């Protein structure tokens, strides 16, 4: 660890040097800091080539008759899809709605999302106008790598001679069209010499400060490090707004190949900028020779609701506070029929949050599906895929996916009623091959585990898929509507992103409550562990405007495994209660847990108490007596491993989850087992709304 | 309606 080349004294720079992990990341920070200290990193003044006095903003006074004619020379679009996550089926649905053989599709998948990449590859192999970027970057939120992704794909696209495209559109997996393809081509064919960028239009000085454009930023170790200050180059105008746009080929050529004073310096300046794509393309355009092509409209609708979408949610990824647009709901449908201005795409859409609005929008554009079409109201989302390995999983999800598989195996045995040999007895084998989330009518239905097992009657391996559903635990005895416990609370969408509520000893539960309209009220909350120990108690103010309330009580770890309980009171008057499971782990570092580990993990906190303040007084006043036997059995349970520990866990899962059904993928000896492709709930069942087939005469897929 | 994804330093 050699010292730097310059004395580093900046509070911001030193704060980054400390939190940084890798040595490579420490030196790259010092180098960046010392270069800017010497005034050799950022440009100071820039040439403006625009002949105009300021901003142009050519209007597109919109009449509905502007998108009805047939173009004799229609434009061909190059769609660039920057995707990441698990929603492969939703992305396949949107790709199906925007596809036309005359267009082109260039897909960049985040390096973190290998599962999604494997699926996108199967699409690029079917169609000659679909390709995937051989290069893949970790496009963190706000990261400077996003502009590097766009600028590279423009270079790559301009060099693809066999792709004569005219426009450049960027879409995410949460975007969806709100107008047909024929109308898009007609509108763009009439304005093929324009560039569509949307500006903030508000105060420019406040936009610069809020965006941090006068701050030095560095991307490294998948983090945006704030290093210090910088001046705004003199002699140019700086503008920005939305980073979703349409750009014509001629202007993409200029950004890519030009070597003038403007493009060169702006590529250096924005290499160290937070959210560069929200400002780089505006600045270059307004100061380039193409400044008279700017239309102040990106042709997008963005569901901004800062009252919910700004919670400084990206604090752990960037050294700045970020905002995010919200997801559309069925009530937002009428907004897609607005007359004011031209709009062709909208975001964000998340199937796991609300699919109804997606189905409404798609049928409104391209008609209903035939009668008897299966799966139109269902959604499946893969959450684990065998090729990514069990080390991609945690010890919690691995212990509980194994349990669900066994639970399903026990339902197969009990389903066949006979006095002879049971041809539905199975012995589990290996590790799960995949897991899926399952939704029906925007209602979470549970997990789908695919797994291997030996049919013991015929002594043969079989592949199976199991459906498990959680048992309802919310009970009412008022403004209260619901109450839940989980981790990964999404403040924007106000829901848990850990859907199954899978928890282990070392997790930190969060208790959420949902309230309806009414006057202010103060309630009480009580947490109770599996052996009637009260871990915490606190009161909450529920104002007249309160719709959701949550809190994470500070509990010393590890938590005692078992079925916990959370109760809500109102001056000693019971209101409701809910239950959650803290599952004991059968795996340590993806290996069978040892007694010295199981002992130290399944036997309450290391301080013999969850908090410093005790609550032994409330136990008698709540009929919560502590049984000397159950406390004894809990201490004897902590010591168990292997078979005995398996019986402990499966007994807890059994009391909190239900194996709804189980199907076989191939041949099976169990006569009461249906084939997965013939069921309504399996991920093997038909799902035409997301299935991609052959192209039709009209050049379409939908 | 409005644009700009950054909220601010704090």
Numbering used by the authors:
A (entry chain A): 252 to 728, 735 to 959
B (entry chain B): 211 to 220
Q: From the publication, what sentences describe this entry?
A:
The first enzyme in the pathway, peptide O-xylosyltransferase (XT, EC 2.4.2.26), catalyzes the transfer of xylose from uridine diphosphate (UDP)-α-D-xylose onto serine and thus determines the site(s) of GAG attachment on the core protein. XT1 and XT2 are type II transmembrane proteins consisting of a short amino-terminal region facing the cytosol, a single transmembrane helix, a stem region required for Golgi localization (Schön et al., 2006), a catalytic GT-A domain (Lairson et al., 2008, Müller et al., 2006), and a unique C-terminal domain of unknown function, termed “Xylo_C” in the Pfam database (Finn et al., 2008). XT1 has a two-lobed structure, with one lobe comprising the catalytic GT-A domain and the other comprising the Xylo_C domain. To better understand the initial step of GAG biosynthesis, we have determined crystal structures of human XT1 complexed with UDP-xylose and various PG-derived acceptor peptides.
